[PDB]
């Protein structure tokens, strides 16, 4: 319907795509680095989610330049996506309040 709802939907789909690609790319970037732990896909996908939500427990993280670059993309995609949802909620509340005031 409205632009904000559409944008929020698209952002969520975009995020899921970034989570999957980031998981795949993180493993590709980290294998070959002695000591790295972000090296199998199941846990890499878990890592991508706790990174996108900015929780970052510290159980897993990248040690290489390219793994870190991948991490930044996931971080920004998560922060932006969740932020966009907040903006969509605000727009919805603002429209409803204008109606309620009879504006």
């Amino acid at each position: 319907s409205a632009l904000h709802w559409r944008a929020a939907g698209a952002a969520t789909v975009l995020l899921v795509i970034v989570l999957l690609a980031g998981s795949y790319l993180a493993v590709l970037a980290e294998r070959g680095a002695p000591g790295a732990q972000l090296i199998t896909y199941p846990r890499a996908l878990w890592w991508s989610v706790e990174t996108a939500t900015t929780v970052g427990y510290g159980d897993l993280y990248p040690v290489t330049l390219w793994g870190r670059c991948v991490a930044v993309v996931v971080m920004v995609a998560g922060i932006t996506s969740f932020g966009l949802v907040t903006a969509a909620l605000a727009t919805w509340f603002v429209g409803r309040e204008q109606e309620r005031r009879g504006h």
């Epitope: 795949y24 590709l28 294998r31 070959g32 680095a33 002695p34 790295a36 732990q37 090296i39 199941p42």
Partner: antibody, heavy 118, light 106 residues
Framework: QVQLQQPGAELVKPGASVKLSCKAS????????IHWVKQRPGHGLEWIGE????????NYNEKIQKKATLTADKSSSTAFMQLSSLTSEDSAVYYC???????????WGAGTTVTVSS | DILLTQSPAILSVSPGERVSFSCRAS??????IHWYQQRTNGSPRLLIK???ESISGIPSRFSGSGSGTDFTLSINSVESEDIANYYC?????????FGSGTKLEI
């Protein structure tokens, strides 16, 4: 059916090189990695390296002298290992194994016995 | 690189008795340990994954346990076909590494 097919043997003259092959069957995923393991007679298993066919990137064991170069042919679903300038120290059984990106070697090839002799 | 220590190198047991193989990691690796069986002239065969997960087609007398640095592969009532070399392998940190192996004698 046999998931990984490797030739039974290869005779190599000292100083020369050889190209081992590992043909894969069964399910193939973008997350699959093909590994190579070396086993000298009477000795244990030694990891040589790995390659991800979907991207073509390979990594190698840093603890040993690099004698191998890994490549893969996506169309023929075959992984290759080029061993160069071999010595008698390189005589052994070389296995290829498939890992689904989750850390363990689910299936192994029969192994190729490489003998370095004149 | 993670060092996996398997000791003793040879384990002697009477037929039908329970036996346990030891694998110790140089640092804590959760449950990222896998076990393989290799008979004379054969290729390694996956027995247990992630320390204790059973694999389809593997006899029920095979089980694994442990976490952290100490792991164990156990065989309830060992039999002739169990005669082989057993190896542990870790996938917690790059690169993957193998233990030196333990031989089972009856």
């Amino acid at each position: 059916q046999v998931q990984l097919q490797q030739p039974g043997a290869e005779l190599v003259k000292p100083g020369a090189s050889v190209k081992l092959s590992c043909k894969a069957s069964g399910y193939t995923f973008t997350s699959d990695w093909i590994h190579w393991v070396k086993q000298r007679p009477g000795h244990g298993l030694e990891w040589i390296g790995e390659i991800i066919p979907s991207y073509g990137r390979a990594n190698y064991n840093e603890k040993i002298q690099k004698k191998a170069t890994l490549t893969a042919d996506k169309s023929s679903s075959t992984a290759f290992m080029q061993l160069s300038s071999l010595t008698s120290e390189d005589s052994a059984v070389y296995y290829c194994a498939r890992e689904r990106g989750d850390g363990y070697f689910a299936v192994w090839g029969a192994g190729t016995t490489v003998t370095v002799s004149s | 690189d993670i060092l996996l220590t398997q000791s003793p190198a040879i384990l002697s047991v009477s037929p039908g008795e329970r036996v346990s193989f030891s694998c110790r990691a140089s640092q804590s690796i959760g449950t990222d340990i896998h076990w393989y069986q290799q008979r004379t002239n054969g290729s390694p065969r996956l027995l247990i994954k992630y320390a204790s997960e059973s694999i389809s087609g593997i006899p029920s007398r095979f089980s694994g346990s442990g976490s952290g640095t100490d792991f164990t592969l156990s065989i309830n009532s060992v039999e002739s076909e169990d005669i082989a070399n057993y190896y542990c392998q870790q996938s917690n940190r790059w690169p993957f590494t193998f233990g030196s192996g333990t031989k089972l004698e009856i």
